[PDB]
Design a protein around this ligand. Structure first.
Ligand SMILES: Brc1cnn2c(NCc3cccnc3)cc(-c3ccccc3)nc12
Length: 279
């Protein structure tokens, strides 16, 4: 740790403080996360090999004094801050599409390696001046924590959920980019679940076979009717709404995969614009 000079706290991750820092040696500017069980060390060690242009690079893993420090590549801005900055006119559709496309590429990569993120949220989607967007904290899961992006199968007590939970989260973020308001801003697990039911309809055996057997499912759940996506994410076009609908499928087995999503017609005209970043 004496090999780094802390420049500033750049947030408070779900595992500890995150600092912009400088390598007192090479002068390199990095993101330093302060998080030990052997399982943790081995698993994290695998993460150092999971390299892709849309995944924030894990430079080094420092274990000292029973302390765990993760050294990452540094990115100047996160998607929450950017959405807040583009709140007046909204993020241009071509840039939303680009970002969604890139994130789907990062997801497809991780998923092909059986690595899940599990906690995707605007705060951990990082952007740079070149129009790149990257996933931060991938594989780590394996201040109130936000439930807004949590998949229904997790909320219903599914113990062995899979890659589909990340597609759900990314669907919620896509919607938020488009409308400029959180899709399902729950402030408790039941509030989150009910916000989802009120919009997508209370799930049942017809749309989600086996849902009624889920650990936390209750027959006493109110039965709300599903809303039209046209009302949910105006003025997203038909391609966008169609893709969104597939990313928000209740059944995790019906939920579109990242790889399939990349082939959706929505991306037919994808480009890579440059955002205006005021650092
Ligand atoms: Br790895 C990592 C590399 N950059 N980075 C950033 N940079 C964005 C930024 C830069 C400068 C000032 N404020 C924000 C934020 C978070 C993060 C992730 C989760 C929660 C909080 C922060 N993790 C990282």
């Amino acid at each position: 740790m004496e090999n780094f000079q802390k420049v500033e706290k750049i947030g408070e991750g779900t595992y500890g403080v995150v600092y912009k820092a400088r390598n007192k040696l090479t002068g390199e500017v990095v993101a330093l996360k302060k998080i030990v069980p052997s399982t943790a060390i081995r698993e994290i060690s695998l993460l150092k090999e999971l390299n892709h242009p849309n995944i924030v690079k894990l430079l080094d893993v420092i274990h000292t004094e029973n302390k765990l420090y993760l050294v990452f590549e540094f990115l100047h801005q996160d998607l929450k801050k950017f959405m807040d900055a583009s709140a007046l006119t909204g993020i241009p559709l071509p840039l939303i599409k680009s970002y969604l496309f890139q994130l789907l590429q990062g997801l497809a990569f991780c998923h092909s390696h059986r690595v899940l993120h599990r906690d995707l949220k605007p705060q951990n989607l990082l952007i740079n001046t070149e129009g790149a967007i990257k996933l931060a904290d991938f594989g780590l899961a394996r201040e109130v924590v936000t439930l807004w992006y949590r998949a229904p199968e997790i909320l219903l007590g599914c113990k062995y959920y899979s890659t589909a939970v990340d597609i759900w989260s990314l669907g919620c973020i896509f919607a938020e980019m488009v409308t400029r308001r959180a899709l399902f801003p729950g402030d408790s697990e039941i509030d989150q679940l009910f916000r989802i039911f009120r919009t997508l309809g209370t799930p049942d055996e017809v749309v989600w076979p086996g849902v009624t057997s889920m650990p936390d499912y209750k027959p006493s759940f109110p039965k709300w009717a599903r809303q039209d996506f046209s009302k949910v994410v105006p003025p997203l076009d038909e391609d966008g709404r169609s893709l969104l609908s597939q990313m928000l499928h209740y059944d995790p087995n019906k939920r579109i995969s990242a790889k399939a999503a990349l082939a959706h017609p929505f991306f037919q005209d994808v480009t890579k614009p440059v955002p205006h970043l005021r650092l």
